[PDB]
Design a protein around this nucleic acid. Structure first.
Ligand SMILES: [Mn+2]
Ligand SMILES: [Zn+2]
Ligand SMILES: [Zn+2]
Ligand SMILES: [Zn+2]
Ligand SMILES: [Zn+2]
Lengths: 49, 1409
RNA sequence: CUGUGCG
């Protein structure tokens, strides 16, 4: 199972998330971590497309 | 009369009081035995026989000493020598409780009469002989036991309690299940039970409890919750940050926005740094000569080789002055070039005892004692020559008149201003620390380290006398006779720390510099020296900690660039201002962050984070911490990017409070504060009976006040909200809790297992005629606030032990309590981690004033109706004994400290002081004993309080499941708990449930502290914070633990404890770059203590594989391998160890011969193992060439601070106040005196041992200087020369025994964002078959004499006494004082999991065999 | 019970 439907990067988000590889991820946090690298910096795996 | 006549012939088998003595026969024999033991007790101390036993005043009236109407005291043995009398009152008490009681009651009763003897006459010498047995010196101690036995057998065949009181003392010895004393009433027990067990029924049905809880929830929802009277509220993070900025960041304060201006020590550190960085940072031959002769003179200072101390100081000053005038000649310019650049200040010269004395005043004092006392030099040098002919290196110093003309010439040459020592407490030229290079900040930390080491050494100065007249603390003092500590900073400039007082107290120091002789003042401050030990050498540990914390915020390049220098400045201010207020504020910040991350927090949270500054030095620290919190938390949208990193950073910033030590800056002030915290709840409650009886007979008013306190304790209704803060418990709610516990409704059931049931002549509800369960109040040093502490007498300690064991067994029979059960704590940790990962409502609850509000009466009311059924009998075991001991605890007497009474008698407003004054003479006499209903002692009924808390918390979980249809699971620890609530189907709908739970907890005695938090983001339990998908490592806490608690007795033990601390810190993911710096700091500590560097100790240059799947033995092996680069000899020794391991395991033919081969030592054992494995005498001589000086060779280092070690550890395993700076001072003091033993009993210096070395420099003495020496380089000192390769062999063999055969292969090197943390398990493969009674058999088989003596003198399981490796890997442990494998084998990992970053595991070494 | 040890 994935996380608790939170950002896993800010925790202050439970609406319209997206899974990285084992947890969830907000939209703005995903776009912030993807626009600087390809890894996740939370799970340390490549971010989705 | 069959045994009455036998005593006539029995007593004949036994110097003055005997012939006179040889149913009054009973008392005749009693008096005979008493006189016999009394004459035996006094013939050892030269008493006088009292043939008349007249009195105490008659023996003074006969001789002539005036009698000032003394109270009639019967003296057993008096020894009056002219004008001095020694009173000896003896007693025979076998049981330790009655022994200590009679001892104290005798000492007090003789001091009360010594007071009046000192008021008129002589001051007696009090002696009391506490014979715990009946062993005399007239017989062989076997007849007196027969006499006592027959006396018992004649009394048992024949006031209220005499026929059992008299025999209870002639028996051998005296737990629970003993209610057969009297079980009598005192016309007060029934009135106590009428107010303690009147409203308890315990047989309530379940449906009625359900309906009553439903109605109570309905009432609470519309009466206490809708009215806004709840104790919990939502976060509103904006409001939280505003309140934080308003409470911490002082805006209405006129202090500057600069830490250096407001803190005097920070200003001094800045001055020293930026005057040593901008300016500078046979030349070192004369300074070395001066330092050597100064050390020599400091040696003969504390040797008492003279009559007086002033004459000793004058003689050493004469020696130093003669050395100065000798160095003045034979050199072109020695003083003006090397004294100005070394150790000399304006007009003053450095002397012994850390002193500096003006040269003119020095020659003025030397003119005396030589002018008014001629021929003094000759007879003061001849007394030194014939006393220590080893310090006779003084040849041209201890001579006649030291060229007074040349002396005054030197004095008039260096005429500079004297140190001012500013005693009285602006422009802001401070370069704006934020805008400093990364080198100037490290220089600030190094300067703080040097000044802190000088502060520590200032506490080292022994109590000397001032040679000059005091011309001292008004506004300023031109120093002429101050002590000075010298800290070296740069090639030319050196810092001086002047101070005028000694000891461990707070002083006013003055820091000066010497660039090239121009002594410039750097400042003057006031501090306590023993609070500056953490930065003593951690100029790089704290820098590495700050670097790691800043790297945690690498997600926002620009946030770390702002929070980096702010964090370094915060650490610097915390170190330069160690105060309990800063600790309290940083703990408050921890709780604020815990509330900020979650969603629900207490309404009175911010009211507890406020800490009165009382100084700008606290204002700057609070401003820095609040600014850090705001910079990391404030913002609208793009301010919670990586909130896990932010929470970790801020939690570590809050745990930076552990950098400040906990040593009670003022002991009397902290005792006063402890007494205040102890007596304020009682005075506020209304039950503070003072000095009740100390025996157990309360007066009418005292019984009335106790019954009133008990009634007030149980007078809390269930429908009132104006009583949710006063101590007490609702009787109906407790009845519901107990009734649900009895009928198996709670998660903890009464069906327990392993029944816990396992002079005091008459007992009652108050006492047992053996005291009144007297405790004594004191404090316990903690980080935030000093905890309470109760030190009890022997009998009350036994009673607490009884009740604590009962409650601990009951709790072990329970399920959800985790205080002394690590399995349940790990289950709680797993459940809390799963709850935080699943988004459950974790409620981290703390309970305020748990001890000071809990009452043994509450535990009585609980246990009165608890079922506590048996596992096999189902008989409802009666709790009469436990209830009787809890009644004794209800009427306990807590002795207040005598210092507190004295401080309150010689005395602003204070509630405790007001109560003291009101009890001084208004009602009775001075208060010395306090009895009360509430305030169960912290650490006294810990297990009983945990049992009550667990039962009540399971009832609260049942109530929550009933009312709000949630799934709660709670884990308590008797102080704090955590409740994981799985909710059905934010967190604003569960605020009502939280407020209702708090209300119900307060209706019991479980007042939820404002530090408790409720949320779905982070949980806390036992200071272990768990976050979504991880756990906060608490780096700063463990780093500060490694820098603190340096309990340095022996350097080996110090290194061992530091290694265990670094292991437990790497387990919680600290670093491998910070742990190597901690190890470097500890090695630098050991090296500074004069012990020098040794091939063992703290492990530098380590990887995670040295801590994961590796013990201390493997770390020492890796250290030895790092010593031997390009491993040709260590590889050969590892091959030999593998060969021995194969011959003992594969060939399996080696046993009891290696033990005979090892007991020789290091050279012979290594030679034998090499002949058994390699058999090449050339290679053995090439291997034994590597030596290391072992100071603990012929035993252990002799040390007086403030046989193998395995036997000591086994003895400690079978059987069941001083600061760290003072401990390090004692360590440095013991490691500089005669500590090295030479086997013949003559201890010698470490300097004498290390002077016996020679410059070998033959490519074997150069691979590790001052650590590894040649064999011929230690020909002068060959006794302290052991082969390091033998220790390496032994370490490798024990590592093979412990953690597998992979320790033999050569280390190969491997061919990551610094935040890829993950858990790794120890990859050890034990070849030992994984306890007790196995090492004992091992020692018994091999060593018969060492098992007989020094081991097993107090054992009772000798009827028990073949593991694969317990014969050779035990000799290797016993013969090596620093290996210690058996202590690791008879122990668990204590970590079982290591959080490490993948950046470290990718750089770990590969050693797969 | 006694230390001169930051280079
Ligand atoms: Mn807690
Ligand atoms: Zn991810
Ligand atoms: Zn997000
Ligand atoms: Zn300033
Ligand atoms: Zn050599």
């Amino acid at each position: 199972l994935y996380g608790r439907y939170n950002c896993k990067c800010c925790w202050f988000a439970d609406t319209n998330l997206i899974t990285c590889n084992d947890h969830y991820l907000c939209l703005r946090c995903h776009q912030t971590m993807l626009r600087n690298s390809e890894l996740c910096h939370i799970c340390w795996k490549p971010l989705p497309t | 009369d069959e045994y009455v006549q036998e005593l006539k012939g029995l007593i004949r088998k036994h110097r003055c009081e005997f012939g006179h003595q040889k149913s009054p026969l009973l008392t005749e024999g009693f008096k005979l035995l008493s006189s016999l033991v009394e004459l035996e007790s006094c013939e050892a101390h030269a008493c006088q026989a009292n043939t008349d036993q007249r009195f105490v005043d008659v023996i003074l009236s006969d001789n002539g000493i005036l009698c000032p109407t003394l109270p009639k005291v019967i003296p057993d043995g008096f020894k009056l020598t002219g004008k001095t009398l020694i009173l000896l009152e003896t007693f025979v008490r076998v049981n330790p409780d009655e022994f200590e009681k009679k001892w104290k009651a005798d000492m007090s009763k003789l001091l009360n009469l010594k007071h009046d003897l000192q008021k008129s006459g002589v001051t007696l010498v009090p002696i009391v002989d506490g014979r715990s047995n009946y062993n005399n010196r007239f017989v062989a101690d076997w007849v007196i036991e027969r006499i006592r036995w027959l006396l018992i057998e004649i009394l048992k065949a024949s006031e209220d309690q005499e026929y059992q009181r008299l025999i209870h003392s002639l028996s051998n010895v005296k737990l629970e299940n003993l209610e057969h004393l009297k079980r009598n009433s005192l016309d007060y027990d029934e009135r106590l039970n009428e107010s303690l067990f009147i409203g308890l029924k315990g047989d309530i049905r379940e449906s009625t409890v359900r309906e009553e809880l439903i109605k109570l929830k309905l009432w609470f929802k519309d009466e206490v919750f809708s009215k806004g009277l709840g104790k919990f509220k939502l976060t509103d993070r904006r409001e939280l940050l505003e309140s934080l900025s308003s409470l911490g960041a002082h805006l209405d304060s006129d202090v500057s926005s600069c830490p250096f201006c407001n803190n005097k020590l920070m200003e001094i550190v800045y001055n020293v740094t930026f005057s040593c960085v901008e300016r500078t940072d046979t030349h070192s031959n004369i300074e070395k000569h001066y330092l050597s002769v100064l050390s020599l003179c400091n040696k003969i200072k504390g040797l008492k080789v003279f009559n007086t101390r002033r004459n000793t100081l004058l003689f050493l000053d004469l020696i130093m002055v003669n050395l100065m005038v000798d160095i003045s000649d034979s050199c072109q310019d020695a003083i003006e070039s090397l004294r100005k650049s070394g150790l000399i200040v304006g007009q003053m010269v450095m002397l012994v005892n850390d002193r500096v004395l003006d040269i003119l005043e020095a020659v003025k004092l030397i003119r005396k004692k030589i002018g008014t006392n001629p021929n003094w030099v000759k007879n003061c040098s001849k007394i030194l020559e014939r006393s220590h002919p080893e310090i006779w290196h003084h040849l041209s110093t201890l001579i006649k008149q030291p060229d007074f003309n040349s002396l005054i010439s030197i004095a008039q040459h260096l005429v500079s201003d004297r140190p001012i020592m500013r005693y009285s407490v602006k422009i802001c030229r401070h370069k704006l620390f934020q805008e400093m290079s990364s080198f100037e900040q490290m220089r600030l930390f190094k300067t703080l380290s040097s000044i802190s080491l000088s502060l520590i050494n200032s506490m080292k100065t022994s109590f000397s006398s001032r040679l000059l007249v005091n011309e001292k603390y008004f506004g300023n003092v031109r120093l002429r006779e101050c002590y000075a500590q010298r800290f070296y900073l740069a090639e030319s400039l050196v810092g001086f720390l002047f101070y005028q007082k000694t000891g461990e107290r707070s002083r006013c120091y003055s820091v000066y510099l010497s660039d090239n002789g121009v002594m410039s003042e750097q400042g003057s401050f006031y501090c306590d020296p023993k609070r500056f030990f953490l930065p003593v050498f951690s100029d790089e540990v704290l820098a590495g900690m700050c670097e790691e914390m800043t790297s945690w915020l690498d997600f926002d390049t620009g946030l770390m660039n702002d929070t980096g220098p702010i964090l370094r400045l915060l650490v610097l201010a915390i170190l330069c201002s160690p105060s309990k207020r800063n600790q309290t504020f940083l703990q408050g910040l921890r709780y604020f962050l815990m509330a900020f991350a979650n969603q629900i927090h207490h309404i009175d949270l911010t009211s507890k984070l406020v800490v009165e500054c009382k100084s700008s030095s606290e204002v700057v620290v609070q401003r820095l911490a609040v600014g850090l919190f705001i910079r990391l938390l404030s913002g609208e949208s793009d301010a919670s990017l990586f909130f896990s990193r932010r929470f970790k950073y801020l939690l570590n910033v809050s745990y930076l409070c552990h950098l400040i030590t906990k040593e009670t800056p003022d002991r009397l002030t902290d005792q006063i504060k402890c007494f205040e915290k102890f007596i304020e709840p009682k005075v506020k409650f209304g039950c503070a009976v003072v000095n009740p009886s100390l025996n157990g007979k309360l007066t009418v008013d005292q019984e009335d006040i106790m019954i009133n306190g008990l009634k007030k304790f149980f007078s809390k209704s269930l429908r009132d909200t104006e009583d949710v803060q006063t101590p007490g418990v609702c009787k109906e709610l407790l009845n519901y809790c107990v009734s649900l516990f009895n009928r198996g409704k709670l998660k903890v059931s009464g069906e327990l297992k392993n029944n816990p049931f396992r002079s005091p002549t008459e007992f009652t509800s108050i006492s047992s005629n053996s005291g009144n369960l007297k405790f004594g109040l004191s404090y316990k040093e903690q980080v935030g606030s000093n905890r309470e502490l109760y030190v009890g007498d022997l009998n009350t300690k036994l009673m607490t032990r009884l009740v604590e064991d009962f409650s601990e067994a009951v709790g072990n029979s329970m399920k959800y309590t985790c205080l002394n059960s690590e399995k349940e704590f790990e289950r709680a940790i797993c459940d809390m981690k799963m709850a935080v990962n699943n988004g459950d409502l974790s409620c981290s609850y703390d309970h305020s004033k748990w001890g000071p509000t809990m009452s043994p009466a509450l535990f009585l009311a609980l246990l009165q109706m608890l079922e506590l059924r048996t596992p096999v009998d189902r008989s409802k075991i009666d709790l009469d004994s436990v209830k009787s001991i809890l009644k004794w605890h209800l009427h306990k007497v807590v002795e207040v400290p005598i210092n507190v009474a004295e401080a309150y008698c010689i005395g602003s407003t204070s509630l405790s002081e007001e109560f003291f004054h009101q009890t001084m003479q208004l009602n009775g006499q001075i208060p010395s004993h306090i009895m009360s209903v509430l305030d169960m002692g912290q650490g006294i009924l810990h297990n009983t309080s945990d049992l009550y808390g667990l039962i009540t918390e399971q009832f609260l979980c049942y109530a929550l499941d009933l009312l709000y249809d949630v799934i709660p699971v709670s884990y308590t620890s008797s102080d704090d708990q955590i409740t994981l609530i799985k909710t059905p189907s934010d967190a604003a709908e569960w605020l009502e449930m939280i407020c209702f739970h708090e209300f119900l907890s307060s209706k019991l005695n479980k007042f939820v502290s404002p530090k408790s938090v409720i949320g779905t983001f982070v949980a806390e339990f036992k200071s272990r914070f768990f976050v979504m998908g991880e756990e906060t490592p608490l780096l700063t806490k463990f780093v500060a633990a490694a820098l603190h608690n340096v309990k340095c007795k022996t350097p080996t033990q110090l290194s061992e404890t530091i290694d265990t601390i670094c292991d437990q810190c790497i387990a919680n993911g600290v670093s491998t770059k910070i742990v190597t710096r901690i190890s470097k700091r500890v090695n630098q500590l050991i090296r500074y203590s004069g012990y020098g560097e040794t091939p063992f100790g703290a492990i530098e240059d380590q990887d995670v594989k040295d801590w994961v799947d590796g013990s201390r033995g493997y770390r020492l092996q890796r250290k030895i391998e790092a010593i031997f680069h390009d491993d040709k000899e260590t590889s050969f020794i590892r091959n030999c160890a593998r060969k021995v391991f194969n011959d003992i395991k594969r060939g399996r033919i080696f046993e009891e011969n290696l033990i005979n081969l090892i007991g020789r030592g290091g050279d012979e054992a290594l030679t034998g193992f090499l002949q058994y494995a390699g058999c090449s005498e050339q290679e053995v001589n090439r291997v034994l060439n590597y030596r290391w000086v072992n100071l603990s060779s012929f035993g252990d280092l002799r040390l007086v601070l403030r046989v193998p070690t395995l036997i000591k550890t086994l003895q400690s395993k079978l059987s069941r106040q001083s600061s760290v700076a003072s401990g390090f001072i004692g360590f440095c003091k013991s490691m500089g005196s005669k500590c090295v033993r030479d086997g013949k009993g003559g201890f010698l210096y470490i300097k004498e041992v290390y002077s016996g070395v020679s410059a070998c420099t033959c490519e074997i003495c150069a691979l590790k200087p001052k650590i590894i020496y040649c064999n011929n380089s230690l020909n002068k000192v060959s006794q302290f020369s052991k082969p390091i390769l033998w220790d390496y062999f032994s370490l490798v063999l024990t590592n093979a025994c412990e953690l597998g055969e992979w320790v033999f292969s050569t280390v190969k090197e491997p061919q990551n964002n610094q935040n890829f943390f993950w858990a790794v398990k120890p990859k050890v493969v034990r070849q030992i078959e994984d306890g007790m009674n196995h090492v004992l058999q091992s020692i018994r088989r091999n060593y018969p004499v060492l098992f007989d003596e020094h081991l097993t003198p107090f054992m009772n399981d000798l009827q028990v006494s073949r593991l694969k490796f317990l014969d050779v890997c035990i000799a290797l442990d016993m013969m090596n004082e620093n290996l210690g494998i058996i202590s690791h084998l008879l122990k668990t990992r204590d970590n079982s999991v290591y959080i490490v970053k993948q950046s470290d595991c990718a750089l770990a070494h590969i050693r797969q065999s």
